[PDB]
């Protein structure tokens, strides 16, 4: 950590009604900072990021989600401290995280948003960051997040005429149906799934 680093406190100085929860770790890069952002302010915060002076040169590197409902500390349970970020995973249905890179500040900024509503509603930002379109499409299809005000909600990387969210911990890697060829129908069909257990 022998570098010059400054917290991205501009967001919370401007959005004066929000509380700040920020982290930095040596597990990340020296210039990488994590923060907690509420969903109802996520869209406005991205609006501010996309056009603030020092945050103008910001690109949305990555976006995804975590099914925190089934998250459990498998080892060193007692070592957990109240300041750790893992404390926000427990009992929360979903956690959608975005990661941006800023060139002026040579920094990486990750924002975590907790989704507790059962339908997983959150405002999309693909209208602010263009590359977020396919990222949010993938996230919605794989985890079932209901993005709102999204440019294109059509599936991306999922099969035709199928509805599912495979990346949820409830889903099984083997799937629920297999595609074979039917001679009677003289074409590919899909039927129930029987697999091999090692």
């Amino acid at each position: 950590m022998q570098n010059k680093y400054m917290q991205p406190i501009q967001l919370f100085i401007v959005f004066e009604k929000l509380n700040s929860k920020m982290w930095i770790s040596k597990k990340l890069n020296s210039n990488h900072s994590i923060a907690l952002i509420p969903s109802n302010w996520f869209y406005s915060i991205n609006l501010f990021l996309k056009r603030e002076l020092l945050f103008s040169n910001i690109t949305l590197i990555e976006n995804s989600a975590i099914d925190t409902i089934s998250y459990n500390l498998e080892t060193n349970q007692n070592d957990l401290d109240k300041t750790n970020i893992e404390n926000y995973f427990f009992k929360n249905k979903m956690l959608v995280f975005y990661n941006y890179y800023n060139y002026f500040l040579k920094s990486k900024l990750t924002l975590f948003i907790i989704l507790n509503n059962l339908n997983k509603n959150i405002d999309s930002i693909d209208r602010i960051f263009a590359n977020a379109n396919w990222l949010e499409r993938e996230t919605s299809e794989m985890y079932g997040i209901n993005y709102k005000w999204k440019i294109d909600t059509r599936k991306l990387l999922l099969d035709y005429s199928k509805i599912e969210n495979p990346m949820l911990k409830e889903f099984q890697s083997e799937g629920t149906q297999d595609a074979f060829y039917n001679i009677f129908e003289n074409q590919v069909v899909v039927l129930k799934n029987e697999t091999v257990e090692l």
């Binding site: 997983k120 209901n146 294109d152 035709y160 005429s161 129908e185 074409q187 590919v188």
Partner: protein, 172 residues
């Protein structure tokens, strides 16, 4: 309107005209439009089950208006009549009619519109997409059905029918 369903997305009726010399019109409701769908914006949020139900009814109306074209292009008219397909999809919706979450309903409507567009544009295969249109308890109209099970187990409870049928291979 700059949308796939816009009134200007119709297929021209002629190389030099739209259906007439004194009028401009085209069909985009019962067939696919002229330009492909580049973006499908999310359904505007519904704050009420009333709005959610209206969305469901409008989606079902679009599906019913499109089913004959889907059947003709996919060559599945023999398997079921247009009305039979409409009723089967109605049963599909009825199984889901218990929903009471507007956000979940909006997500479901988005998925339904997407799959309907795939069926229009031949993205899906007829055998893969007919699972939604297939009858729940009636034989397919293009095949000869077997009533051996009904003859054997006439006037017998579903439990007894399942008991005789079995639910596991007997070899192992």
């Amino acid at each position: 309107m700059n949308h796939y369903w816009g009134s200007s997305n119709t297929i021209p009726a002629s190389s030099t005209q739209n259906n007439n010399y004194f009028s401009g019109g085209g069909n985009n409701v019962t067939i696919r439009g002229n330009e492909i769908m580049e973006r499908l914006p999310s359904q505007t949020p519904s704050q009420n089950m009333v709005q959610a139900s209206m969305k469901t009814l409008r989606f079902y109306r679009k599906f019913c208006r499109l089913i004959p074209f889907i059947l003709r292009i996919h060559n599945i008219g023999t398997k079921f009549t247009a009305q039979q397909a409409m009723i089967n999809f109605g049963n599909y919706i009825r199984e889901r009619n218990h929903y009471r979450d507007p956000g979940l309903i909006d997500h479901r409507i988005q998925l339904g519109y997407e799959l309907l567009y795939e069926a229009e544009m031949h993205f899906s295969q007829h055998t893969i997409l007919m699972q939604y249109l297939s009858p729940y308890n009636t034989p397919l109209s293009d095949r000869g059905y077997s009533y051996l099970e009904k003859v054997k187990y006439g006037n017998k409870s579903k439990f007894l029918q399942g008991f005789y049928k079995g639910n596991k291979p007997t070899e192992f």
